[PDB]
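Students often ask why we bother predicting the structure of a whole assembly rather than each chain alone. The short answer is interfaces. A chain on its own may look different once its partners are present, and contacts between molecules only exist in the joint model. In this exercise we take three input lines together and write out one structure for the complete complex. Read the inputs first and try to guess which parts will touch.
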Amino acid sequence: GPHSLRYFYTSVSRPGRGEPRFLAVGYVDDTQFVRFDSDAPNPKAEPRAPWMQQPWVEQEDPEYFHRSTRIFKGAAQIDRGNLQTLRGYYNQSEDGSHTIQRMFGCDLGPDGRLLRGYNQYAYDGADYIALNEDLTSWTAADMAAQITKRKWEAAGDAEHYRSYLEGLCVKWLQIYLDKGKETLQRADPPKAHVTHHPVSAREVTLRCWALGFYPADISLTWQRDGEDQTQDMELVETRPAGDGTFQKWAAVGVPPGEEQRYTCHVQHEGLPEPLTLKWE
Amino acid sequence: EPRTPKIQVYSRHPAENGKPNYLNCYVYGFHPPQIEIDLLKNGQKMKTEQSDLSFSKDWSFYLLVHTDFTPSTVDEYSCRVNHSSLAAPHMVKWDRN
Amino acid sequence: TPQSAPHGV
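Now the answer. The structure tokens for the assembled complex follow.
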């Protein structure tokens, strides 16, 4: 189905506390597979999935890590530049710490071929500049971003992101997807169970738990005799278990005696048909 | 214009007082990325591992801080978070539900 | 595989 390769770059100036720190991680869908930190003593790109520590890497590209290392040092160095210029652009003082984030990558259609390219930036947490899916044109979010747009259009930088995306990005996404088949393409269904928690004489909380699933995408809902009550239910954000699987709970406070009128609804990629369940 | 972190404290698996487990503290939706996250046993700082820094579509950052623990009726676990968005550290008590 | 931007902003 729809798969994505994403890199996430964060640089943070630390006025007084030394030069900027660069961090980079790479993901395929919800699975991290590489990291880099410019504070590490002898800083290299490091595998962070098992399937990135298998011999296939050597044969596909014997220099894989040295290359990602090289790129990440460049990326780090450029952002040390950016943080000075953006200071300038926004006429900001020397003492404040500021943040530059880049997220770039590709999505695939279910055909296999490129669906969408991404290359987008934020400054101090807010939209700055982003490449349109024409892969020629930028959206600058403000007057400082306009300087950047004019610069990169005049210079024809979009072309380079286009060739990376059209060549490398899709190619490696497919490589990682095929090489990591058993972890990435093998979806784990959620294991759901309902728990009963008396929380007064007027309401006993019925909580629907969904656990050990991959990927993170999931819909948890409570229905009351066919009536979805998403507006009257408590539902946490999906959370990482710590073992590559995710967790989520939805809870409704019902009057005691009405337990069997509710039905928990679980929909998930790895489930054949949707789960429906209630108190024991 | 800081964004305040949302915090969830919970165990990798359903908690049986006595069975070794993993205690998670998931903090998300924050900005800037400078943040202090400790797991406490009876208010004392435990040795933990913190995930590689990352961020969501909206640019807010997220971290998993985790450790091995064995739940006791004798023991209290909490997650302690200081961010620029907070007047002072917030602590969230671990509850098996 | 990563990619670094040709120029700064």
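Check your guess against this: Residues 1 and 7 of chain C are 19 Å apart (CA to CA).
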